[PDB]
Design an enzyme around this catalytic site. Structure first.
Site, PDB file in Angstrom:
ATOM      1  N   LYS A   1       0.837  -1.186   0.000  1.00 26.82           N
ATOM      2  CA  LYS A   1       0.000   0.000   0.000  1.00 26.82           C
ATOM      3  C   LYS A   1       0.880   1.247   0.000  1.00 26.82           C
ATOM      4  O   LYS A   1       1.871   1.327   0.726  1.00 26.82           O
ATOM      5  CB  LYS A   1      -0.922  -0.018   1.209  1.00 26.82           C
ATOM      6  CG  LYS A   1      -1.880   1.140   1.279  1.00 26.82           C
ATOM      7  CD  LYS A   1      -2.571   1.221   2.638  1.00 26.82           C
ATOM      8  CE  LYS A   1      -3.552   2.388   2.685  1.00 26.82           C
ATOM      9  NZ  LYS A   1      -4.295   2.443   3.985  1.00 26.82           N
TER      10      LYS A   1
ATOM     11  N   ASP B   1     -11.163   5.563  12.522  1.00 33.47           N
ATOM     12  CA  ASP B   1     -11.488   5.444  11.095  1.00 33.47           C
ATOM     13  C   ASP B   1     -11.066   4.120  10.452  1.00 33.47           C
ATOM     14  O   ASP B   1     -11.198   3.938   9.247  1.00 33.47           O
ATOM     15  CB  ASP B   1     -10.965   6.652  10.316  1.00 33.47           C
ATOM     16  CG  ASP B   1     -11.491   7.961  10.873  1.00 33.47           C
ATOM     17  OD1 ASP B   1     -10.744   8.965  10.890  1.00 33.47           O
ATOM     18  OD2 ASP B   1     -12.660   7.973  11.318  1.00 33.47           O
TER      19      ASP B   1
HETATM   20  N1  LIG Z   1      -7.335  -7.642  -1.784  1.00 32.88           N
HETATM   21  C1  LIG Z   1      -7.186  -6.743  -0.798  1.00 32.88           C
HETATM   22  N2  LIG Z   1      -7.763  -5.550  -0.900  1.00 32.88           N
HETATM   23  C2  LIG Z   1      -7.517  -4.785   0.183  1.00 32.88           C
HETATM   24  C3  LIG Z   1      -6.761  -5.087   1.301  1.00 32.88           C
HETATM   25  N3  LIG Z   1      -6.740  -4.004   2.188  1.00 32.88           N
HETATM   26  C4  LIG Z   1      -7.465  -3.103   1.577  1.00 32.88           C
HETATM   27  N4  LIG Z   1      -7.971  -3.509   0.364  1.00 32.88           N
HETATM   28  C5  LIG Z   1      -8.797  -2.752  -0.573  1.00 32.88           C
HETATM   29  O1  LIG Z   1      -8.020  -1.673  -1.077  1.00 32.88           O
HETATM   30  C6  LIG Z   1      -8.801  -0.447  -1.060  1.00 32.88           C
HETATM   31  C7  LIG Z   1      -8.259   0.565  -0.037  1.00 32.88           C
HETATM   32  O2  LIG Z   1      -8.453   0.275   1.383  1.00 32.88           O
HETATM   33  P1  LIG Z   1      -7.933   1.279   2.506  1.00 32.88           P
HETATM   34  O3  LIG Z   1      -6.886   0.602   3.306  1.00 32.88           O
HETATM   35  O4  LIG Z   1      -9.114   1.778   3.247  1.00 32.88           O
HETATM   36  O5  LIG Z   1      -7.250   2.427   1.761  1.00 32.88           O
HETATM   37  P2  LIG Z   1      -7.732   3.878   1.850  1.00 32.88           P
HETATM   38  O6  LIG Z   1      -6.882   4.675   0.942  1.00 32.88           O
HETATM   39  O7  LIG Z   1      -7.707   4.266   3.275  1.00 32.88           O
HETATM   40  N5  LIG Z   1      -9.259   3.933   1.388  1.00 32.88           N
HETATM   41  P3  LIG Z   1      -9.747   4.124  -0.118  1.00 32.88           P
HETATM   42  O8  LIG Z   1      -8.588   3.757  -1.024  1.00 32.88           O
HETATM   43  O9  LIG Z   1     -10.808   3.094  -0.407  1.00 32.88           O
HETATM   44  O10 LIG Z   1     -10.208   5.559  -0.223  1.00 32.88           O
HETATM   45  C8  LIG Z   1     -10.241  -0.926  -0.892  1.00 32.88           C
HETATM   46  O11 LIG Z   1     -10.803  -1.284  -2.171  1.00 32.88           O
HETATM   47  C9  LIG Z   1     -10.067  -2.142   0.016  1.00 32.88           C
HETATM   48  O12 LIG Z   1     -11.148  -3.039  -0.107  1.00 32.88           O
HETATM   49  C10 LIG Z   1      -6.152  -6.368   1.396  1.00 32.88           C
HETATM   50  O13 LIG Z   1      -5.453  -6.831   2.312  1.00 32.88           O
HETATM   51  N6  LIG Z   1      -6.431  -7.138   0.272  1.00 32.88           N
END
Ligand SMILES: Nc1nc2c(ncn2[C@@H]2O[C@H](COP(=O)(O)OP(=O)(O)NP(=O)(O)O)[C@@H](O)[C@H]2O)c(=O)[nH]1
Ligand SMILES: Nc1nc2c(ncn2[C@@H]2O[C@H](COP(=O)(O)OP(=O)(O)NP(=O)(O)O)[C@@H](O)[C@H]2O)c(=O)[nH]1
Ligand SMILES: Nc1nc2c(ncn2[C@@H]2O[C@H](COP(=O)(O)OP(=O)(O)NP(=O)(O)O)[C@@H](O)[C@H]2O)c(=O)[nH]1
Ligand SMILES: Nc1nc2c(ncn2[C@@H]2O[C@H](COP(=O)(O)OP(=O)(O)NP(=O)(O)O)[C@@H](O)[C@H]2O)c(=O)[nH]1
Lengths: 297, 314
Positions: free
Chosen positions: B109, B237
């Site tokens: 990420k 959050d």
């Molecule tokens: N396959 C997978 N998808 C994930 C994982 N963690 C998060 N996601 C997905 O990646 C995206 C981002 O999640 P998030 O951690 O909330 O990131 P964010 O930037 O805070 N939120 P957002 O990107 O949705 O605005 C979402 O579509 C979520 O479902 C993981 O371990 N595996």
């Protein structure tokens, strides 16, 4: 686990550096040919380690490898495997600037900025010559060239294959090229570096000659055409009987590349002969040439 | 023979960095214990190549690894071997910032400087928590933290174990918070392939997950200590990510795959958040449920969160 445990931070950085560049190279494909840019090229890495792995390494240091594609090719052409070279530098700290890898296979000499400049200057023709002579030469076999930055201080190194056996103890050495001879204090050192006169008026020959002379002429000719001088012929002598006080006089000609058995008709020793110091014409070459042509009987 | 080939130089550099740092760490012995300095430590490498090795890597780049002794240890406590980690990152380029390793084991990420700071702020406590909870947690398992520098631009990255299976396919997903504020998905998002459904979307479908008591109890106990730990630090959050795998549908999709050319089981050592549907649910399913995004007040945020997830499943 190579810790890079060594007597001085600089040796550690050398070990780290060789290890690093050779692993990196193992990730680089062997090309169909060297290219012009390969002769103008370098890798540079800078390390800045806060509170980490500074048990042996400096926290901050630089390491630069000149023309890694070229020196890896030279390595291959000198019959030297990258992994063995890496092990020789890294498996244990090199020993006492003039250094030797713990196993005595490779020499690491500290050199000047202008030595590095000059090496860059001869490198293309030198390589082409190694090609054309199929790595059969008395010239130094250059294996790698590095710049280390440690405590803000740049240091330059050149790695060569050892002239001497990495196993057979050398009992007497001569550095052959006016007139020169060994000093009243150097003659009091353990293994003295004798010179032309000390050799002449001692009346020593080396019962062995074809290969050596053909080779030697071709080489000093090449060095002439580059307008280089001051190079010496290093000669080393291991007395078999003296050692005898896993056999005596036994060696691997594919490792100790310059070694040479004494002829069956001789008063039995091992000779090592190779041209050193050419990082600096005709007359020097033919003079050198004849002086050495008269040592072999 | 790793070329670090990738569609973007950032990814090549990511691959090179994980490769380099893992090999380096291979020379560093494994300590009896972690020291305070390990939590304030970093490694930094700056590369300026000239006319050399430019097919994939840029000639100039920087790579920084945060608290590497710590993350190594973390990897160990999560049952992840460094060579496997390395291989997952470097054998082939990660794929679509939100990346996944080519083999789907790890999530990479892209984060902010703020995020990195909060990781440091919480790191000693997160570590000790992982220690006393024995790795059994719905919280993100942090495996590595990095800063890449390409073209004078700095990019921060956090690596986690995937919440989802590295093999099984996810057919439906939810990001759940429990907010009083309404949380649905957009027409935009709902038009996507695997949309990110949310709270009111979950409520609307009468959706429920039947896992059976013995799994429910484990889940809920994990959750209670997890959100209590999060509440302690000023953490809010954060969400529960919910993946649903339709076993039958998958057998079908496989069948279409083998035609155009085991069943609902998983290795819980690997698919760490996976739960089988109750022996007597309707359609047989696999769920993946974890807390994500941890980098009104926190206490009440966690009460509001815990009640909602507690009701998310029977
Ligand atoms: N396959 C997978 N998808 C994930 C994982 N963690 C998060 N996601 C997905 O990646 C995206 C981002 O999640 P998030 O951690 O909330 O990131 P964010 O930037 O805070 N939120 P957002 O990107 O949705 O605005 C979402 O579509 C979520 O479902 C993981 O371990 N595996
Ligand atoms: N064992 C070993 N010794 C070497 C080798 N090459 C050089 N030496 C030794 O190290 C010294 C370095 O010689 P050289 O290359 O001429 O360096 P220099 O400082 O320019 N010349 P000088 O010897 O007068 O100081 C020589 O005296 C020689 O005895 C080698 O391959 N193996
Ligand atoms: N609490 C805490 N925060 C840290 C620590 N190390 C870094 N951070 C925070 O993490 C953020 C990212 O830092 P980083 O990008 O590495 O760069 P920098 O340290 O700001 N300096 P530079 O950008 O010149 O490299 C910064 O806001 C920094 O304050 C640490 O040990 N503890
Ligand atoms: N539930 C279910 N659907 C099937 C099965 N076999 C085929 N189908 C569905 O029938 C449709 C046509 O199948 P195909 O023969 O692949 O053409 C597809 O949409 C496919 O999903 C099956 O065994 N079960």
């Amino acid at each position: 686990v190579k810790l890079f445990r060594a007597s001085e931070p600089i040796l550690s950085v050398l070990m780290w550096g060789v290890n690093h560049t050779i692993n990196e190279l193992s990730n680089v494909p062997v090309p169909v040919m060297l290219m012009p840019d390969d002769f103008k090229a370098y890798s540079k890495i800078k390390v800045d380690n806060h509170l980490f792995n500074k048990e042996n390494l400096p926290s901050r240091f630089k390491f630069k490898e000149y023309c890694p594609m070229v020196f890896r090719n030279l390595r291959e052409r000198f019959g030297i495997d990258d992994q063995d070279y890496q092990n020789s530098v890294t498996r244990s700290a090199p020993i006492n600037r003039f250094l030797t890898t713990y196993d005595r296979r490779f020499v690491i000499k500290t050199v000047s900025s202008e030595d590095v400049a000059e090496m860059h200057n001869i490198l293309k023709k030198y390589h082409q010559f190694i090609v054309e002579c199929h790595g059969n030469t008395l010239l130094p076999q250059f294996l790698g060239m590095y710049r280390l930055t440690v405590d803000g201080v740049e240091t330059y190194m050149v790695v060569t294959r050892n002239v001497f056996s990495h196993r057979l103890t050398v009992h007497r050495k001569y550095d052959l090229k006016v007139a020169r001879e060994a000093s009243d204090k150097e003659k009091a050192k353990d293994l003295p570096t004798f010179k032309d006169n000390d050799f002449l008026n001692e009346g020593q020959k080396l019962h062995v000659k074809k290969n050596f002379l053909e080779k030697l002429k071709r080489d000093v000719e090449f060095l002439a055409q580059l307008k280089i001088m001051d190079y010496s012929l290093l000669v080393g002598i291991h007395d078999v009987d003296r050692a005898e006080q896993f056999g005596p006089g036994e060696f691997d000609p594919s490792v100790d590349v310059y070694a040479m058995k004494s002829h069956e008709s001789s008063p039995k020793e091992v000779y090592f002969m190779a041209i050193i110091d050419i990082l600096t014409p005709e007359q020097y070459s033919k003079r050198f040439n004849e002086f050495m042509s008269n040592i072999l009987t």
